[PDB]
Assembly symmetry: D2
Homo-oligomer: 463 residues x 4
Amino acid sequence: HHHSSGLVPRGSHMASTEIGIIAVGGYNEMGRNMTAIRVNEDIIIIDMGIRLDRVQIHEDVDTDRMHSLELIEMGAIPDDTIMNEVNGNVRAIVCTHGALDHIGAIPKLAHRYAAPIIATPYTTALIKHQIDSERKFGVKNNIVALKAGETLEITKDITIEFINTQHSIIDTVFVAIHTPSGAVVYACDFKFDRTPTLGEVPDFDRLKELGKEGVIALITESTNAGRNGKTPSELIAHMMLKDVLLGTEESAVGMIVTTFASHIARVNSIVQFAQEMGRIPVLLGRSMERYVGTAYQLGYIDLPENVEIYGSRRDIDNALKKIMEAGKDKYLPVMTGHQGEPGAVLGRIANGETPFKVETGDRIIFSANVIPNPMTQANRYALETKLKMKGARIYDNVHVSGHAYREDHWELLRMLKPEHVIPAHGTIQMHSEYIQMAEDAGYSLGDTLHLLRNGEELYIEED
Amino acid sequence: SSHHHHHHSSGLVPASTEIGIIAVGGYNEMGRNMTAIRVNEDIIIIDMGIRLDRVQIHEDVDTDRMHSLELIEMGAIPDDTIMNEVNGNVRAIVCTHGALDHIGAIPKLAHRYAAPIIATPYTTALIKHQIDKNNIVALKAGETLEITKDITIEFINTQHSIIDTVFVAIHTPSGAVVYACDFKFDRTPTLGEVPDFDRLKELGKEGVIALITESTNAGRNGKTPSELIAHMMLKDVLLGTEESAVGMIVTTFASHIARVNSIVQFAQEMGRIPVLLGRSMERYVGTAYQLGYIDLPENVEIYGSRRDIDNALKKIMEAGKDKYLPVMTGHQGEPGAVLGRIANGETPFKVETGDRIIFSANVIPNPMTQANRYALETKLKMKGARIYDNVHVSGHAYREDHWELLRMLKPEHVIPAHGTIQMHSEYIQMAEDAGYSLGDTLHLLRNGEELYIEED
Amino acid sequence: HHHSSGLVPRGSHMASTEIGIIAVGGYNEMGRNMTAIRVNEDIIIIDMGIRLDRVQIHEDVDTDRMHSLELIEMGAIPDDTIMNEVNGNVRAIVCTHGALDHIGAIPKLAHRYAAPIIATPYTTALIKHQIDSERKFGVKNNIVALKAGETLEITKDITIEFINTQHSIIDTVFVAIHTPSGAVVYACDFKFDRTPTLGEVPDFDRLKELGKEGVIALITESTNAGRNGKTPSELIAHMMLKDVLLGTEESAVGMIVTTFASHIARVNSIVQFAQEMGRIPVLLGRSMERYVGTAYQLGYIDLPENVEIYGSRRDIDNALKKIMEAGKDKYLPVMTGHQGEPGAVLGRIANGETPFKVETGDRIIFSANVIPNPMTQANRYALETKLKMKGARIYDNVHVSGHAYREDHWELLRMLKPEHVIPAHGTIQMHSEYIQMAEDAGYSLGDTLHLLRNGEELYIEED
Amino acid sequence: SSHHHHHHSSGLVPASTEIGIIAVGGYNEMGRNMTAIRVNEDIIIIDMGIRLDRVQIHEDVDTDRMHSLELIEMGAIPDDTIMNEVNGNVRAIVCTHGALDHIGAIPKLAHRYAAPIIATPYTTALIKHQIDKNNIVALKAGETLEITKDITIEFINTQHSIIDTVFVAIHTPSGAVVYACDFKFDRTPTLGEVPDFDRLKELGKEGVIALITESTNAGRNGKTPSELIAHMMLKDVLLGTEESAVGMIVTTFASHIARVNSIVQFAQEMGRIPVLLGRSMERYVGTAYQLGYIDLPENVEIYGSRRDIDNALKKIMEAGKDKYLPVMTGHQGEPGAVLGRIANGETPFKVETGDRIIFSANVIPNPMTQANRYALETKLKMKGARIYDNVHVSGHAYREDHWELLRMLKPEHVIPAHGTIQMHSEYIQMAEDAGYSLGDTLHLLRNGEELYIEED
RNA sequence: AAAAA
RNA sequence: AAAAA
RNA sequence: AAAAA
RNA sequence: AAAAA
């Protein structure tokens, strides 16, 4: 004899999709970021970064004579040889922004793929300017400019959407890969910033919509997931830098500012402050000219008429000779070398290889943090020791992070409601931080939350 | 056969003043600050603080049952028994502000001196409320008070993590002795005034014999971020949220009136009614309001007693946590404070997953307070709370702030105070950069030592 | 038409075994260790520890009135309710040693299982003495004494082997669970020590043999896997303590030594040193009497005739009154309270609640480390501050770790050659350290190397 | 009407000596140690060291092309130009041992003084080899040397990370000035003798005016572990292995002769032939052997030149790494050292997975050396090496060692040296526990300052 | 770099 | 959490 | 708390 | 990497 135990309504499945999340670089370390998203047999590569400290430990630096495999053995750059064991063909290369941890390895690995590079206008410009700077013949991927808010079809089954976000470089995007079974979202090198000083407010609405439409997997950075609270706004750094530059009873002293050439919002703030304190803003260093110049040409920043930009050593040295013999109090040199890079303008000033002589009382403002690696900490120590031994006053860490804190990740997780989460852009320790946060959010390790190592592929079969 | 020459000096003259800088407390540690400035035989005492951590290591606090000498043996409070060896008489007791590290020992030591207590209005109010006896004189920033035919005291406005904080300048016939401790340059305060740089420069040109100044954050690079920074960060944490109807608790220094001000303003700007909870909140904020230092919105609610507080939390819980912004005590996980009691479930307020707890304060770097803070945060986290930490800006001068202070006052002698010998070491390296020499024009004093400064 | 592509010789499989590695407690934190090894449908529980700091954060301590579930909610103790979702029956409970992070939760959870407790003689003694110390009625598991080197049959298919190892408590073992498909080895709270001061030299031969016989899975601690090199021998701590106690030109000063009551090798060394410096070794504190007394009765340590042991408050206070009024220079008090435990002898001396008064010059030797938790760091700070304020001279950290370092794990891995490795006894951060080491040894995460969280079961099907 | 009384003192007497303690270098930093002790108008210089990190921040080392003044501007070496303001004449230059932080600046500054260099035999040997000019006098531990009718210098044996290290006692008609820097109490040395506690106590009772002593590890709790501890740990690392035929490299201080001794002994006990590689290994160990301080087994091999070294490594590689124990330079990842060259693959020796690299040294806490060490270890690890770090014991006295030193010598005045102001702060807290008072009997000197001590 | 009731 | 010419 | 060739 | 009575 037999009783009924109830009934189960079974859902339909009009599209099965096989998703691959391939960790190539930047899952075991910082710098050489590369991820590959496989939809069935088509592959979208996301970012191709470089890791600088692996270049610095070798007294040979070179980095432009060495080709891909030697750099991979140093790594340095992502080991993409594993792509030969991935069951698909690369259809596109997305670069979510233009800093070296996302495009630094483009000129070394991108030319081997039969795919266009898709990026934002500013990013595309930086990639182009960089590709045209190796002159080894000679294949160049075409570059498609895709703006935040725009969508691009790659395949009958694959579309790529850019969503604007904030970061320490302008024009940074989340990328959503739409598949017949739903979306794969990539959100790395980002920060929620509700009061940006240059870009736009993050697209929380679209994030929520995506959440409701269906997100299969989220690949997101774990870099500062261990840091408590929310990332302070860029406005905070704006305010602090303002206070450091204007708030002084020793006004006619002579001040040098140094920061990331790629941090366009920061540089912008600095030149405005120069205009508010009666000094002539003069930008020094090749990379200043590259990044800030490019940002200006494409209309991302406005520059005052008296702004001066110098890229060549003799232009720079003669500009510093002009400043030195006119009164340091009349200029605000905005220059490269905050990490004590050998050869940068500030490092050359510190060695006295320059008409500019730092004298007691002079104020040097590092609008940047020291990167937690022994190499750059050494270069910074030597730089600072020299500058102080010549009597300079050091203003350090006038800066705000470009990365999401724990609660930023919390809210992102609540908005996108991803089915699977994969931490990226960090060490396994950082991923451990992220994992604990995500578990608090209801995710389970090995189930809906996944710890990948470089070279590993997560297979997801969506019904 | 051999010769040389020398001019001899004449014994002719073309009232001498002897200065003593007596370090009493707060030169070997944090908290129990007390300095004594002797002009020949008249003495001005500056500040009388308490050190809380030396009270915490003994589980039996009752800081009002113990008399002065036992507190000194714990210390806790400054050892002023050394004043029995100082060749002078105390003519005044100056308190540069009203926080416990400047007035905490007032009720235990001040009564032994036949001298008035001189302080700013707010400070005087807190001292009065605290006593529950020296005369108390209210002296405002910018005003001068004569103490003796030869001695006057000037208050100069400055900024700090408590309102109405002053530098004090002791004017003598030989020049000024300046005391600048527990201070911060802030050119964009959210409460009070910008410090008096003009007067500092004037003083410098008039002649400063000695500067007694804090070394607390002399080790920190750069300049102290403005209170405006903490204002902005707190705004971002409180308003910048897609988890809006969650229920938020803010905790901070009850004495940081500027901060509490910012918080209640934000409460009015996020459509929650601000409820201030805890006895000390009632004390400091209440007093600040009565004296017209802070303005409060009509809907502001304050509860100091245990049952008032618990019934307020029962009211809040059963009306919607999303409708209130409780501003409460317990940011250091103080046993008995409102937040610590909420965390222990001894309260109608129950923390549930998602609730946001904002510590508008840093954790005090002492093992005791780090323990209490750890236990508190662990409990709150285990009940599902989301912790926003360090939404805060320092109340103390950084290295370059001291650089500029030194270059404005141009003192003949400098003495670091308000810290450990390590903090003083930082200050010393900075001052050496400015041209001072240790043991000559720069002096590292320990508690109990008297520095003699003579006229050339 | 058809060609042959070669042949493949296929192996036989005369016994399939399903293995479960269940992480119950101590995989997300320190202290409350509990693991469960499932062979088909029979379960061997390994260790049942407590986490002390979770008790300390509550101002209520109690820990003996509270029953299991409240302790689990604090946790504190392992959440073994998950055992109701594990497909098997518990046949035995192994305790690899007698310290609280292995037997601290025995009296709270063991009585719910219909299984005997298997342990070494010393461990068994401590478990018995502890069980007879709750007097709540009243079920007591029988305890089987199994010595290092001995094997015990539990099932037609399951045998348990003890292998001697070293640790900060005497009589510690690796446990090997022999199954028809091979062995599961558990090696937690251990240290290679080639010159022990009490136990035996580790059984490297047997480890190698096991390796060759076939190890399915290794569960091993990750606690100090991050620490570089090899764990220093106990002999090092012996030497340092000797030097601290004898090497002094201020000989008749009065010295107090404090250490782990359970560290029998250490205490032994101390009383021998007392005999070598003409002082009477007097042991104070209830737990000293418990652990050292027990170790003496079972013949693990020899004690000199003049040794004195006191467990009660009045015996202790009058012993200190005797010492105080006879000359501190004539005694070596060996007492509890190295973590500044409220109520311990040293903590009571520090509060002046004792005939013993510490005076300037007096030397207090902490033969122990400070546990990296804010609670115990607070208690230690208060204790030390009081002792120094009474003029004592503090000798700290005269101690050597009880846990394997990175290279110790390296060699263990090379000896056992396990098919699968699972890190245990630590946070996810410690496990991350272990994971990197194991990857260097050839293991692969998610494949032969497994990261478990509390409540998770790894299923292994051995052919 | 009113009265009191006082006894007046007589102007009768019931040769005065003025002591100057001049801090020249090594009081604000590590490395460039130099002190000058003035007795009225005769001066004894003690030590002349170099500071390596100030040389490293400039990539252009050549420390022999630069003359004294440029090295002083880098400093690098002590600024002894201040000696032009000191009212006295240098009668002797004492070097308490032969490591670079005591003799590194000898070839740059010693030649300007009309005075002999006095040192222990080994120290004299290293100075002589280094010079490639003052007279050099060898003075042994336990011996005394007359310098002046009023001044004698006594050497007292002590222990340290280099052999033949001494305390120096300067005897004057008013008592002794004792210098105890770069030292360690070690009652179980593996080389040399136990320090002379008897003589220290004797000195104490005879009368010590001033003690100049290191503060380097005064912050570390307890007592310095004996060199025997490092011996034992090194034994455990080298012999205690189930990975026996792997190939092992040991690196340590070339000047730490006791350590190298232990290592070669262990090499003979593990059936490997000890090969010492590197120029400085050849210098220090060679010199120590010739003078009979260390004994070497018959099979010992030493190579100082580049091709000798490379061909030795080619020999080793092609005979079996398991048969050799290379003892080489480069523990701090010094560019050009043997280990750094092996790590860069510029060498017949190739590191392969499993190889054990033993650093019998700690990493020096400076960003430069931490960088070099990081790059080195990363390379070695990337070639599969297993790193055994910190197999080492400190060469400097801990807090309680200083406690007992102070209680033995009973000096009237104490001056910390050989460290930063932070290290001195640690020492100061310890000395205050011992009864000394800062600015009175306890003195914190900076480079360039002269402390005057008069007779009562 | 502060308390808390 | 970044380079630099 | 030290260099290295 | 541990308790304590």
